[PDB]
Amino acid sequence: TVASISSGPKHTQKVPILTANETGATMPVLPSDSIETRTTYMHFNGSETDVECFLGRAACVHVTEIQNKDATGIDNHREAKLFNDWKINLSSLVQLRKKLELFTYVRFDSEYTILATASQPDSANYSSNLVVQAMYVPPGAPNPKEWDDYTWQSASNPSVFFKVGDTSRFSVPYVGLASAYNCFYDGYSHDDAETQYGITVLNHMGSMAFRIVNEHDEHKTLVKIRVYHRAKHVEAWIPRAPRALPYTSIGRTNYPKNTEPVIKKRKGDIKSY
Amino acid sequence: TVASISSGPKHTQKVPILTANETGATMPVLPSDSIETRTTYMHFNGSETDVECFLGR
Amino acid sequence: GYSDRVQQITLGNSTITTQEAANAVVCYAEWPEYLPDVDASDVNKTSKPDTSVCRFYTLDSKTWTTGSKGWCWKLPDALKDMGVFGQNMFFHSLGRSGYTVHVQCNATKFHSGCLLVVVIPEHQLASHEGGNVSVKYTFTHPGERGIDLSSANEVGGPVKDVLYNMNGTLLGNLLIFPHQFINLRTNNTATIVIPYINSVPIDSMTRHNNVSLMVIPIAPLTVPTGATPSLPITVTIAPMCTEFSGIRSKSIVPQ
Amino acid sequence: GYSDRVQQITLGNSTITTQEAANAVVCYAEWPEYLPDVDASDVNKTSKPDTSVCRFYTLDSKTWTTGSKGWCWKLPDALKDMGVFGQNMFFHSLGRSGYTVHVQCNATKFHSGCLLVVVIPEHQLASHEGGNVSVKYTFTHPGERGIDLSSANEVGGPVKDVLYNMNGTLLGNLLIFPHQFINLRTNNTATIVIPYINSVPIDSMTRHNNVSLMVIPIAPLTVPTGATPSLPITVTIAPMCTEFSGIRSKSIVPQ
Amino acid sequence: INYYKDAASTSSAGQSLSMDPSKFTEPVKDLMLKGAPALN
Amino acid sequence: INYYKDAASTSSAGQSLSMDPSKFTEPVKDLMLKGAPALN
Amino acid sequence: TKDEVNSYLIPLNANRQNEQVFGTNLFIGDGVFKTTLLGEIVQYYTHWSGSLRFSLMYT
Amino acid sequence: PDTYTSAGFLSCWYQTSLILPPETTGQVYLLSFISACPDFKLRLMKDTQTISQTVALTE
Numbered sequence A: 001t002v003a004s005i006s007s008g009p010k011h012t013q014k015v016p017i018l019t020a021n022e023t024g025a026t027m028p029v030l031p032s033d034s035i036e037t038r039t040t041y042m043h044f045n046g047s048e049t050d051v052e053c054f055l056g057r058a059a060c061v062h063v064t065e066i067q068n069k070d071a072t073g074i075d076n077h078r079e080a081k082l083f084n085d086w087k088i089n090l091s092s093l094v095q096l097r098k099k100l101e102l103f104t105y106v107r108f109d110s111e112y113t114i115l116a117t118a119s120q121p122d123s124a125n126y127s128s129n130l131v132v133q134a135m136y137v138p139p140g141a142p143n144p145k146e147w148d149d150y151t152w153q154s155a156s157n158p159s160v161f162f163k164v165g166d167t168s169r170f171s172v173p174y175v176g177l178a179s180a181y182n183c184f185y186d187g188y189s190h191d192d193a194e195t196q197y198g199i200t201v202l203n204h205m206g207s208m209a210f211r212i213v214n215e216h217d218e219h220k221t222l223v224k225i226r227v228y229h230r231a232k233h234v235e236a237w238i239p240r241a242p243r244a245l246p247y248t249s250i251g252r253t254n255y256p257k258n259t260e261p262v263i264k265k266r267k268g269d270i271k272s273y
Numbered sequence B: 001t002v003a004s005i006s007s008g009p010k011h012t013q014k015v016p017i018l019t020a021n022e023t024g025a026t027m028p029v030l031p032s033d034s035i036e037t038r039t040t041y042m043h044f045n046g047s048e049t050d051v052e053c054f055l056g057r
Numbered sequence C, D: 001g002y003s004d005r006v007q008q009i010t011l012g013n014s015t016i017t018t019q020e021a022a023n024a025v026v027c028y029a030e031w032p033e034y035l036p037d038v039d040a041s042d043v044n045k046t047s048k049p050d051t052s053v054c055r056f057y058t059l060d061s062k063t064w065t066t067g068s069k070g071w072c073w074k075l076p077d078a079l080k081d082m083g084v085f086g087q088n089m090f091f092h093s094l095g096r097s098g099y100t101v102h103v104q105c106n107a108t109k110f111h112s113g114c115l116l117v118v119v120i121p122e123h124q125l126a127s128h129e130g131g132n133v134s135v136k137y138t139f140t141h142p143g144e145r146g147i148d149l150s151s152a153n154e155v156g157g158p159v160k161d162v163l164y165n166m167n168g169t170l171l172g173n174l175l176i177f178p179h180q181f182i183n184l185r186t187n188n189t190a191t192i193v194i195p196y197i198n199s200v201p202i203d204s205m206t207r208h209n210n211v212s213l214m215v216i217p218i219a220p221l222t223v224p225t226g227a228t229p230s231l232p233i234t235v236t237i238a239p240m241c242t243e244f245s246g247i248r249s250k251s252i253v254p255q
Numbered sequence E, F: 001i002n003y004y005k006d007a008a009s010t011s012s013a014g015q016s017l018s019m020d021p022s023k024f025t026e027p028v029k030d031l032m033l034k035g036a037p038a039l040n
Numbered sequence G: 001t002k003d004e005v006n007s008y009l010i011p012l013n014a015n016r017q018n019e020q021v022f023g024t025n026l027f028i029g030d031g032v033f034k035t036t037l038l039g040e041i042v043q044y045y046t047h048w049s050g051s052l053r054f055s056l057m058y059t
Numbered sequence H: 001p002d003t004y005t006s007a008g009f010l011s012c013w014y015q016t017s018l019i020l021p022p023e024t025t026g027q028v029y030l031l032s033f034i035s036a037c038p039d040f041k042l043r044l045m046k047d048t049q050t051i052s053q054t055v056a057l058t059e
């Protein structure tokens, strides 16, 4: 594959470098169209910039917390973090979000990796070997209310049991209801004057609940859970303007008020180098 | 596998939507039996509802 | 003697001519088409009114002044009240369509100004309030009037900073979307053919706007010494390959 | 075991069933069809909404009592406000259509009564005033409600004597027109398929009613001892092979 | 070799190797030849 | 490849791919044709 | 007020014209459908698609 | 039940009206049935909200 062909002097009626950008087209002008060039080869395929590679690596998409402690007298297990849940979404942590939002529609399979790390902030005689249970609770499935509900039986919901300090790994097929996931959605759930706007109404993927299976020890253990997402078998459509301003909320395109200029201001002239 | 066949207007002596449930049978009536339909495909096998899968976890 | 500048577009009983065009853009190089069986899900036979809805509808003219920020229309919203197309929109549960957008603006060889005409699929607007505030239905359904980017914020409405495309992205990058410029010194019209773009075969035409059209002044308007400091901008849109499905009662929408 | 009595008619997304029919009449043995090139004059490509207008619309039910004289509807008038069909009617200069008329009326094997259901092409009504008085637009455009033959005369309106078919001809000879009877002891529904009948290829659908449908009690209603002395009559009509031409502004008609 | 029954569990797809920028760079109705006047 | 001697130790069977609802939907003695009067 | 054979009986009234007999939204995983075999099985899954067969038998 | 994903509404009305014969009085009822067409698809298995317990059952 040639990068540049050999091209010499020129004196024509054919002017490749004069165009009309109001047509909306970006004419494929090459260096050999405006200067004398020599032959060079690409020695390059562009593998690393393939959308499969671009979205094909794990990125942290959520961090949450649960803890192992005596549940005696706790009236709201959920609030006490005896167990916690995550309303599944990929737009909470901004790094992966900006990448995905480089496109309008996106379709792919997902590979999840869940890392659980223990912590004992105050006096403990040892570190306990806790087992985490991550259960997927799809829309319509009964949500856990107590860390040891009948819901954790998980007869139909899928769930993994892994050691804290260890990692959990599994993949999920493309689960969108449509032919592709929407990164943006200029619409509502119905024609209502007050209903929510944006993908907020589209990305209703249920949530996944986490808990520590072990009963409590004398001391209290804080387990932090990090979920990583890697896309595979990727397809992307309709490229768009990259995000410029900071995000403020999951799902909305909203940006903060009194935000700072994102375009750098010259320390001098428009003639400055 | 077709999900729905193409079906147009109708004016017959053949009434597929009139049955007698006291027979104990659930006649396989389709949308194309009561409305005008277009052709669509299943793109679906029903793997996840196989008893092997249902009790298989 | 055929030129990129002279064109005629005939849809239904409506025809458009322009003697100062700059070619025409066909979004993602795809001409609109009807929904093929292989992609269909909805089993209802669809209705194709053809020429009674696939024709040019001219919106109300806007006035481009030395201080204009820009305008934003949404489809199919902008045509929600246009003849038979509009009626079909509310009488059916689902619908799908493509369009030919034709923006007009003439001046003289003494004027100067440059409008960016761009089509943005799934243009989800942002709330000027930031945080997690939503943008109420009415404010993204301005209809034929469209949204004036130089108008003041309003409760429940979207942010209208031209610089941030009403969505947190920079104006300069709007060119990644199918667009065209109306550079008075070259142009006087912009034409964009939009094919149906969505993650579903067909969809609700009232609760979802597939794309929004934006006409944004980049190089400000300049009129010759002592001339009227304004120019009109006219938007004409024609639906094409329009299909409606699931006919019934007729929606009653917010406001 | 197929019978003349059991039938199903499916048009668009609407279906009708009857288990006590008496066959069905096809006016002059001709099924409705679209306008062929050889007969066309108007050069405009026509619009064929198909299933969005070719479906069954059910009018308001009438009440048949021991003293009812009869009812008269006019087409396309009676459907002037029915969904997309109605809209197309007023948005186009011209149109042409056929219909499937289905009149319903059930009772019991103890009741008795006989309704004449007839379709009359060019049913030009007479003025009760005689002389050379005309019948004003509104009075021949009752819409879905229809004209009640037992109602009193009104200024500008038509004569309503059932015996004289509202036009100076005798009731008994109405049978020369495509008709059917709903004889409670035999029937419960009447079905008539009407092809487009006119001296012109296509026509205005607001200023001209091609046919009028009449439901006239011949043998009076009779209910069993102590039963409600009334029965409802329902009229359902579906346009077929409907074509519209010359789309524009949308008529504004008298009243 | 694939160890699992479902497609979703396989590893990455491998370079699409299609690459056609023209649907974004030249989405014009009338073909424009490099060198020929853009507006004739 | 199966690593164990007994059948019970192998993994899931894979879609039966039979699917005949009629033994539940139409367990009638005399065949009933869609469209023909249910009770003749 | 409680589960009864009567909750399966849709009342029909003589000599009523135009009137409505019954109504219901079509969330097959809730409401009237929730306890039916269809609704019951449907609830073992998150997504559904296809056509429903609704029948009425006169008694 | 999800709004964006709603299926619509089902209703029944009197086309004409119910007529009873002599010496017959009161109410007649309709029985309604629901089932899926071969059209039907179901996916993403999950636990149902139609069953639960507070403690393990014993013999």
Ligand SMILES: Cc1cc(CCCOc2c(C)cc(-c3noc(C(F)(F)F)n3)cc2C)on1
Pocket (backbone or CB within 6 Å): A088, A089, A090, A110, A112, A134, A135, A136, A158, A159, A160, A170, A172, A175, A181, A203, A205, A208
């Ligand atoms: C955009 C976009 C795309 C997606 C896909 C979300 C996938 O949702 C899941 C997740 C996050 C986990 C599981 C899952 N299955 O088993 C487990 C367990 F191990 F966590 F229990 N988790 C299943 C689905 C459908 O979400 N937002």
